[PDB]
Design a protein around this ligand. Sequence first.
Ligand SMILES: [Mg+2]
Ligand SMILES: [Mg+2]
Ligand SMILES: [Mg+2]
Ligand SMILES: [Mg+2]
Ligand SMILES: [Mg+2]
Ligand SMILES: [Mg+2]
Ligand SMILES: [Mg+2]
Ligand SMILES: [Mg+2]
Ligand SMILES: [Mg+2]
Ligand SMILES: [Mg+2]
Ligand SMILES: [Mg+2]
Ligand SMILES: [Mg+2]
Ligand SMILES: [Mg+2]
Ligand SMILES: [Mg+2]
Ligand SMILES: [Mg+2]
Ligand SMILES: [Mg+2]
Ligand SMILES: [Mg+2]
Ligand SMILES: [Mg+2]
Ligand SMILES: [Mg+2]
Ligand SMILES: [Mg+2]
Ligand SMILES: [Mg+2]
Ligand SMILES: [Mg+2]
Ligand SMILES: [Mg+2]
Ligand SMILES: [Mg+2]
Ligand SMILES: [Mg+2]
Ligand SMILES: [Mg+2]
Ligand SMILES: [Mg+2]
Ligand SMILES: [Mg+2]
Ligand SMILES: [Mg+2]
Ligand SMILES: [Mg+2]
Ligand SMILES: [Mg+2]
Ligand SMILES: [Mg+2]
Ligand SMILES: [Mg+2]
Ligand SMILES: [Mg+2]
Ligand SMILES: [Mg+2]
Ligand SMILES: [Mg+2]
Ligand SMILES: [Mg+2]
Ligand SMILES: [Mg+2]
Ligand SMILES: [Mg+2]
Ligand SMILES: [Mg+2]
Ligand SMILES: [Mg+2]
Ligand SMILES: [Mg+2]
Ligand SMILES: [Mg+2]
Ligand SMILES: [Mg+2]
Ligand SMILES: [Mg+2]
Ligand SMILES: [Mg+2]
Ligand SMILES: [Mg+2]
Ligand SMILES: [Mg+2]
Ligand SMILES: [Mg+2]
Ligand SMILES: [Mg+2]
Ligand SMILES: [Mg+2]
Ligand SMILES: [Mg+2]
Ligand SMILES: [Mg+2]
Ligand SMILES: [Mg+2]
Ligand SMILES: [Mg+2]
Ligand SMILES: [Mg+2]
Ligand SMILES: [Mg+2]
Ligand SMILES: [Mg+2]
Ligand SMILES: [Mg+2]
Ligand SMILES: [Mg+2]
Ligand SMILES: [Mg+2]
Ligand SMILES: [Mg+2]
Ligand SMILES: [Mg+2]
Ligand SMILES: [Mg+2]
Ligand SMILES: [Mg+2]
Ligand SMILES: [Mg+2]
Ligand SMILES: [Mg+2]
Ligand SMILES: [Mg+2]
Ligand SMILES: [Mg+2]
Ligand SMILES: [Mg+2]
Ligand SMILES: [Mg+2]
Ligand SMILES: [Mg+2]
Ligand SMILES: [Mg+2]
Ligand SMILES: [Mg+2]
Ligand SMILES: [Mg+2]
Ligand SMILES: [Mg+2]
Ligand SMILES: [Mg+2]
Ligand SMILES: [Mg+2]
Ligand SMILES: [Mg+2]
Ligand SMILES: [Mg+2]
Ligand SMILES: [Mg+2]
Ligand SMILES: [Mg+2]
Ligand SMILES: [Mg+2]
Ligand SMILES: [Mg+2]
Ligand SMILES: [Mg+2]
Ligand SMILES: [Mg+2]
Ligand SMILES: [Mg+2]
Ligand SMILES: [Mg+2]
Ligand SMILES: [Mg+2]
Ligand SMILES: [Mg+2]
Ligand SMILES: [Mg+2]
Ligand SMILES: [Mg+2]
Ligand SMILES: [Mg+2]
Ligand SMILES: [Mg+2]
Ligand SMILES: [Mg+2]
Ligand SMILES: [Mg+2]
Ligand SMILES: [Mg+2]
Ligand SMILES: [Mg+2]
Ligand SMILES: [Mg+2]
Ligand SMILES: [Mg+2]
Ligand SMILES: [Mg+2]
Ligand SMILES: [Mg+2]
Ligand SMILES: [Mg+2]
Ligand SMILES: [Mg+2]
Ligand SMILES: [Mg+2]
Ligand SMILES: [Mg+2]
Ligand SMILES: [Mg+2]
Ligand SMILES: [Mg+2]
Ligand SMILES: [Mg+2]
Ligand SMILES: [Mg+2]
Ligand SMILES: [Mg+2]
Ligand SMILES: [Mg+2]
Ligand SMILES: [Mg+2]
Ligand SMILES: [Mg+2]
Ligand SMILES: [Mg+2]
Ligand SMILES: [Mg+2]
Ligand SMILES: [Mg+2]
Ligand SMILES: [Mg+2]
Ligand SMILES: [Mg+2]
Ligand SMILES: [Mg+2]
Ligand SMILES: [Mg+2]
Ligand SMILES: [Mg+2]
Ligand SMILES: [Mg+2]
Ligand SMILES: [Mg+2]
Ligand SMILES: [Mg+2]
Ligand SMILES: [Mg+2]
Ligand SMILES: [Mg+2]
Ligand SMILES: [Mg+2]
Ligand SMILES: [Mg+2]
Ligand SMILES: [Mg+2]
Ligand SMILES: [Mg+2]
Ligand SMILES: [Mg+2]
Ligand SMILES: [Mg+2]
Ligand SMILES: [Mg+2]
Ligand SMILES: [Mg+2]
Ligand SMILES: [Mg+2]
Ligand SMILES: [Mg+2]
Ligand SMILES: [Mg+2]
Ligand SMILES: [Mg+2]
Ligand SMILES: [Mg+2]
Ligand SMILES: [Mg+2]
Ligand SMILES: [Mg+2]
Ligand SMILES: [Mg+2]
Ligand SMILES: [Mg+2]
Ligand SMILES: [Mg+2]
Ligand SMILES: [Mg+2]
Ligand SMILES: [Mg+2]
Ligand SMILES: [Mg+2]
Ligand SMILES: [Mg+2]
Ligand SMILES: [Mg+2]
Ligand SMILES: [Mg+2]
Ligand SMILES: [Mg+2]
Ligand SMILES: [Mg+2]
Ligand SMILES: [Mg+2]
Ligand SMILES: [Mg+2]
Lengths: 63, 100, 51
Amino acid sequence: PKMKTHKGAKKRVKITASGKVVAMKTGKRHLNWQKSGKEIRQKGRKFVLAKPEAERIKLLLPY
Amino acid sequence: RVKMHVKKGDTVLVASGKYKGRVGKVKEVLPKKYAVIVEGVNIVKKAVRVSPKYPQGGFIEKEAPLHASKVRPICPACGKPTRVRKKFLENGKKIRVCAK
Amino acid sequence: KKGLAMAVADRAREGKLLLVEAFAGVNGKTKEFLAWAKEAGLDGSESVLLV
RNA sequence: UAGCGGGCGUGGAUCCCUGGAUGUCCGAAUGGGGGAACCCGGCCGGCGGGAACGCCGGUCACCGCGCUUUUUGCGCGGGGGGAACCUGGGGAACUGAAACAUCUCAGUACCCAGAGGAGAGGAAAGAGAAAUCGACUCCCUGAGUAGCGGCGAGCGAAAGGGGACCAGCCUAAACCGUCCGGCUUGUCCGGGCGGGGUCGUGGGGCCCUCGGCAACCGAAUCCCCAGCCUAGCCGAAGCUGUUGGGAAGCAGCGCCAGAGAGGGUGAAAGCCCCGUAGGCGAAAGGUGGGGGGAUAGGUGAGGGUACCCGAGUACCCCGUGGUUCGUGGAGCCAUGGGGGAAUCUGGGCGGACCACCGCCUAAGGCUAAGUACUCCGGGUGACCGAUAGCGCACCAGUACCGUGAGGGAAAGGUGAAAAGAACCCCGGGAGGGGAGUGAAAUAGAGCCUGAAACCGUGGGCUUACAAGCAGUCACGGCCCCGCAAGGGGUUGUGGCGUGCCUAUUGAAGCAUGAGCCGGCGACUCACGGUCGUGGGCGAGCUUAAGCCGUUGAGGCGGAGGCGUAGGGAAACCGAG
Ligand SMILES: [Mg+2]
Ligand SMILES: [Mg+2]
Ligand SMILES: [Mg+2]
Ligand SMILES: [Mg+2]
Ligand SMILES: [Mg+2]
Ligand SMILES: [Mg+2]
Ligand SMILES: [Mg+2]
Ligand SMILES: [Mg+2]
Ligand SMILES: [Mg+2]
Ligand SMILES: [Mg+2]
Ligand SMILES: [Mg+2]
Ligand SMILES: [Mg+2]
Ligand SMILES: [Mg+2]
Ligand SMILES: [Mg+2]
Ligand SMILES: [Mg+2]
Ligand SMILES: [Mg+2]
Ligand SMILES: [Mg+2]
Ligand SMILES: [Mg+2]
Ligand SMILES: [Mg+2]
Ligand SMILES: [Mg+2]
Ligand SMILES: [Mg+2]
Ligand SMILES: [Mg+2]
Ligand SMILES: [Mg+2]
Ligand SMILES: [Mg+2]
Ligand SMILES: [Mg+2]
Ligand SMILES: [Mg+2]
Ligand SMILES: [Mg+2]
Ligand SMILES: [Mg+2]
Ligand SMILES: [Mg+2]
Ligand SMILES: [Mg+2]
Ligand SMILES: [Mg+2]
Ligand SMILES: [Mg+2]
Ligand SMILES: [Mg+2]
Ligand SMILES: [Mg+2]
Ligand SMILES: [Mg+2]
Ligand SMILES: [Mg+2]
Ligand SMILES: [Mg+2]
Ligand SMILES: [Mg+2]
Ligand SMILES: [Mg+2]
Ligand SMILES: [Mg+2]
Ligand SMILES: [Mg+2]
Ligand SMILES: [Mg+2]
Ligand SMILES: [Mg+2]
Ligand SMILES: [Mg+2]
Ligand SMILES: [Mg+2]
Ligand SMILES: [Mg+2]
Ligand SMILES: [Mg+2]
Ligand SMILES: [Mg+2]
Ligand SMILES: [Mg+2]
Ligand SMILES: [Mg+2]
Ligand SMILES: [Mg+2]
Ligand SMILES: [Mg+2]
Ligand SMILES: [Mg+2]
Ligand SMILES: [Mg+2]
Ligand SMILES: [Mg+2]
Ligand SMILES: [Mg+2]
Ligand SMILES: [Mg+2]
Ligand SMILES: [Mg+2]
Ligand SMILES: [Mg+2]
Ligand SMILES: [Mg+2]
Ligand SMILES: [Mg+2]
Ligand SMILES: [Mg+2]
Ligand SMILES: [Mg+2]
Ligand SMILES: [Mg+2]
Ligand SMILES: [Mg+2]
Ligand SMILES: [Mg+2]
Ligand SMILES: [Mg+2]
Ligand SMILES: [Mg+2]
Ligand SMILES: [Mg+2]
Ligand SMILES: [Mg+2]
Ligand SMILES: [Mg+2]
Ligand SMILES: [Mg+2]
Ligand SMILES: [Mg+2]
Ligand SMILES: [Mg+2]
Ligand SMILES: [Mg+2]
Ligand SMILES: [Mg+2]
Ligand SMILES: [Mg+2]
Ligand SMILES: [Mg+2]
Ligand SMILES: [Mg+2]
Ligand SMILES: [Mg+2]
Ligand SMILES: [Mg+2]
Ligand SMILES: [Mg+2]
Ligand SMILES: [Mg+2]
Ligand SMILES: [Mg+2]
Ligand SMILES: [Mg+2]
Ligand SMILES: [Mg+2]
Ligand SMILES: [Mg+2]
Ligand SMILES: [Mg+2]
Ligand SMILES: [Mg+2]
Ligand SMILES: [Mg+2]
Ligand SMILES: [Mg+2]
Ligand SMILES: [Mg+2]
Ligand SMILES: [Mg+2]
Ligand SMILES: [Mg+2]
Ligand SMILES: [Mg+2]
Ligand SMILES: [Mg+2]
Ligand SMILES: [Mg+2]
Ligand SMILES: [Mg+2]
Ligand SMILES: [Mg+2]
Ligand SMILES: [Mg+2]
Ligand SMILES: [Mg+2]
Ligand SMILES: [Mg+2]
Ligand SMILES: [Mg+2]
Ligand SMILES: [Mg+2]
Ligand SMILES: [Mg+2]
Ligand SMILES: [Mg+2]
Ligand SMILES: [Mg+2]
Ligand SMILES: [Mg+2]
Ligand SMILES: [Mg+2]
Ligand SMILES: [Mg+2]
Ligand SMILES: [Mg+2]
Ligand SMILES: [Mg+2]
Ligand SMILES: [Mg+2]
Ligand SMILES: [Mg+2]
Ligand SMILES: [Mg+2]
Ligand SMILES: [Mg+2]
Ligand SMILES: [Mg+2]
Ligand SMILES: [Mg+2]
Ligand SMILES: [Mg+2]
Ligand SMILES: [Mg+2]
Ligand SMILES: [Mg+2]
Ligand SMILES: [Mg+2]
Ligand SMILES: [Mg+2]
Ligand SMILES: [Mg+2]
Ligand SMILES: [Mg+2]
Ligand SMILES: [Mg+2]
Ligand SMILES: [Mg+2]
Ligand SMILES: [Mg+2]
Ligand SMILES: [Mg+2]
Ligand SMILES: [Mg+2]
Ligand SMILES: [Mg+2]
Ligand SMILES: [Mg+2]
Ligand SMILES: [Mg+2]
Ligand SMILES: [Mg+2]
Ligand SMILES: [Mg+2]
Ligand SMILES: [Mg+2]
Ligand SMILES: [Mg+2]
Ligand SMILES: [Mg+2]
Ligand SMILES: [Mg+2]
Ligand SMILES: [Mg+2]
Ligand SMILES: [Mg+2]
Ligand SMILES: [Mg+2]
Ligand SMILES: [Mg+2]
Ligand SMILES: [Mg+2]
Ligand SMILES: [Mg+2]
Ligand SMILES: [Mg+2]
Ligand SMILES: [Mg+2]
Ligand SMILES: [Mg+2]
Ligand SMILES: [Mg+2]
Ligand SMILES: [Mg+2]
Ligand SMILES: [Mg+2]
Ligand SMILES: [Mg+2]
Ligand SMILES: [Mg+2]
Ligand SMILES: [Mg+2]
Ligand SMILES: [Mg+2]
């Protein structure tokens, strides 16, 4: 009883005001070596999901 | 306790079933079963004798008890409910307006 | 609230509501209130919520 | 609980309440033994002729505490049990992580010791950011927040705010007197007793100066009482006719109601009975601060000096436990090992450490209420109604099963009333047939109702040249219903035709399950989500625990929650 927020999610995702869900781009802490400077500049911008946005949101709700 | 009820060995009207209207003295009060025998509800017990002793016992059609509810006490009138009332000491039941 | 008001209202728009004060049938005794009832037109023909 | 056979009661029995008496033997079991309910004794006294024997009454277990001269004694107490609740000492695994070891399940299950109508906790060496709060416990909220986490599974606080309850106390030490023991006579060494003392505006001790107190407070201890509990009592109002086996139904007139809750009476009763509303009651036991009374206790201001303020403790380190905290920057609380102080210029704490600013006074104990539970009594159910409801409506923790721990059933109903069927008849009996009772006997005694499977008797249609998932369609014959057109039962020939469920690409299938009937039998609820939908209100909407009502009446209660601003990891900025 009383759903608990998924801490794992909250620690890496945000609900936007319109109900979207965003997170940092993957693949930018390792594979790094000299990947085009362009790549890593674009691995900085965060993005929105799609369907797991809904899977994701459910894991919150008090949030 | 509590087993007490309407009245005792005395005069009474049967407002019951088949013996409605009939009236007479109650010869026995059974407090446990809550019954009384008067002179009504006579019933023939075809049976021989009632005990392992003596020969002929007769079809003694003697009275069968009645639910104490169907009999009502009575005094200078006709079927008056009971009402207890105490004097300067003890206690005696005056009928609906009279006494005893 | 609304319900309470609306109920009292419904029974007013209906005409059945009646305010009083002239309770001469005081003194807790059914027969008295029974007498006051007739005078007030509560012939006991209809159920009543006496508040 | 009837019967045989005898008794008692208005000189007030039975029965109910309180207290008392008697209470074999076993059981903590306690003189000793023992295979519980048996066996055997010591001492004092009694009974029989009573020395031998036996019976009767009393007494004799063990441990702890205190007096008792070590000795023997004397007194007070402990031992065992209890459904659940409680505390402490120990403490799993399946399981979850879709494997598994950290982790989870969980300090759960269980074992053990103890406490009591409760138990625990409890008057800050606290909280933690307000220069704020002010014992403890309980509820709501804060909050699924802060955090914790093979940052996986998952786990998950506190401050604060709203409520219930409300309460505060006693000592150790410095100091003085006394008693006993000790030496090397000292306001001295130890022990016991009394006085003194008890807190963080730090307090107390000892000295100087003021009352040299009437007073003011006052119990959690006693005493009286009210009230209440353990039996009870009073209690309004109805008759007639009618149908019937039986009124309480139907009808006619009438009444009570602080009582029209419910139950019973041959059916369906406010006024017949038991009650209900409303009132009354204790000699005796239990309870009893709610009221009253008493006692125990309890308290003022400055100055001086530095006597005291709980030790193998604080403190540090090694090993761990607790907390939201899993070694993490890891404090705090607790402590198994090693080292080891100070008495306010003293110590602990505010999350490593240092400084600053503040909080609190460890190393002794006690404390009501609000809280938990339900063996027991009572009240009430949009709770069951005999395969249900407790395992048990009934002679059940029984029968029966098992060496044992343990397992554990089935089984309720005649009728209003036994009026339980005299008597006759067939029969060894059982059981029937009459007679009889009853409204009813196909209510006849494991007897209301009496379904289905299953067995049988009688009647109608049908069958011995016939090939079948048993039926359906058509026509014909026979039998039966209605004046009739018609309908019912049956089946001769003809046409047609691969059971039901399950599982499968596919089943009549030689794939699954079912002997048949009856009854039991499987998508629920709680909390939190997310949509949809019916309404209330709207930049607002809504209360939680609780309090006041009520006894199937609701109101109060804004603490708190969602919404009115987003973006950023954040500092921060803001329709950006
Ligand atoms: Mg990364
Ligand atoms: Mg290249
Ligand atoms: Mg009367
Ligand atoms: Mg007897
Ligand atoms: Mg006699
Ligand atoms: Mg007695
Ligand atoms: Mg006894
Ligand atoms: Mg004994
Ligand atoms: Mg013994
Ligand atoms: Mg023994
Ligand atoms: Mg002799
Ligand atoms: Mg002898
Ligand atoms: Mg002795
Ligand atoms: Mg012993
Ligand atoms: Mg011992
Ligand atoms: Mg000992
Ligand atoms: Mg001695
Ligand atoms: Mg003594
Ligand atoms: Mg004593
Ligand atoms: Mg005990
Ligand atoms: Mg253990
Ligand atoms: Mg495991
Ligand atoms: Mg395992
Ligand atoms: Mg697993
Ligand atoms: Mg699961
Ligand atoms: Mg698995
Ligand atoms: Mg395995
Ligand atoms: Mg691991
Ligand atoms: Mg745990
Ligand atoms: Mg714990
Ligand atoms: Mg434990
Ligand atoms: Mg205890
Ligand atoms: Mg209590
Ligand atoms: Mg307590
Ligand atoms: Mg304590
Ligand atoms: Mg204080
Ligand atoms: Mg802090
Ligand atoms: Mg202040
Ligand atoms: Mg605070
Ligand atoms: Mg406060
Ligand atoms: Mg809460
Ligand atoms: Mg990690
Ligand atoms: Mg845990
Ligand atoms: Mg609080
Ligand atoms: Mg406030
Ligand atoms: Mg509070
Ligand atoms: Mg001491
Ligand atoms: Mg001293
Ligand atoms: Mg002295
Ligand atoms: Mg001394
Ligand atoms: Mg002495
Ligand atoms: Mg001496
Ligand atoms: Mg001395
Ligand atoms: Mg002393
Ligand atoms: Mg004192
Ligand atoms: Mg003192
Ligand atoms: Mg002081
Ligand atoms: Mg001086
Ligand atoms: Mg003076
Ligand atoms: Mg003075
Ligand atoms: Mg004086
Ligand atoms: Mg009083
Ligand atoms: Mg009282
Ligand atoms: Mg009583
Ligand atoms: Mg009466
Ligand atoms: Mg009456
Ligand atoms: Mg007639
Ligand atoms: Mg009739
Ligand atoms: Mg008649
Ligand atoms: Mg009648
Ligand atoms: Mg008249
Ligand atoms: Mg009255
Ligand atoms: Mg009726
Ligand atoms: Mg009635
Ligand atoms: Mg009384
Ligand atoms: Mg008395
Ligand atoms: Mg008394
Ligand atoms: Mg008692
Ligand atoms: Mg008492
Ligand atoms: Mg009290
Ligand atoms: Mg005195
Ligand atoms: Mg004073
Ligand atoms: Mg001074
Ligand atoms: Mg000075
Ligand atoms: Mg001086
Ligand atoms: Mg000075
Ligand atoms: Mg000074
Ligand atoms: Mg000390
Ligand atoms: Mg120690
Ligand atoms: Mg780890
Ligand atoms: Mg842990
Ligand atoms: Mg800390
Ligand atoms: Mg240690
Ligand atoms: Mg000092
Ligand atoms: Mg110095
Ligand atoms: Mg510390
Ligand atoms: Mg601290
Ligand atoms: Mg510290
Ligand atoms: Mg602190
Ligand atoms: Mg700090
Ligand atoms: Mg501070
Ligand atoms: Mg503090
Ligand atoms: Mg203290
Ligand atoms: Mg001490
Ligand atoms: Mg203390
Ligand atoms: Mg000590
Ligand atoms: Mg206590
Ligand atoms: Mg409960
Ligand atoms: Mg229960
Ligand atoms: Mg009970
Ligand atoms: Mg009960
Ligand atoms: Mg039912
Ligand atoms: Mg049955
Ligand atoms: Mg049945
Ligand atoms: Mg059973
Ligand atoms: Mg039984
Ligand atoms: Mg069996
Ligand atoms: Mg069974
Ligand atoms: Mg019988
Ligand atoms: Mg016969
Ligand atoms: Mg023979
Ligand atoms: Mg016979
Ligand atoms: Mg016959
Ligand atoms: Mg007849
Ligand atoms: Mg009939
Ligand atoms: Mg007949
Ligand atoms: Mg029949
Ligand atoms: Mg019948
Ligand atoms: Mg039979
Ligand atoms: Mg039968
Ligand atoms: Mg019946
Ligand atoms: Mg049949
Ligand atoms: Mg046949
Ligand atoms: Mg033929
Ligand atoms: Mg054939
Ligand atoms: Mg063929
Ligand atoms: Mg025929
Ligand atoms: Mg016809
Ligand atoms: Mg055919
Ligand atoms: Mg064919
Ligand atoms: Mg085919
Ligand atoms: Mg099926
Ligand atoms: Mg076959
Ligand atoms: Mg097969
Ligand atoms: Mg298979
Ligand atoms: Mg098959
Ligand atoms: Mg199957
Ligand atoms: Mg079979
Ligand atoms: Mg469902
Ligand atoms: Mg929903
Ligand atoms: Mg709406
Ligand atoms: Mg609201
Ligand atoms: Mg307000
Ligand atoms: Mg306020
Ligand atoms: Mg952001």
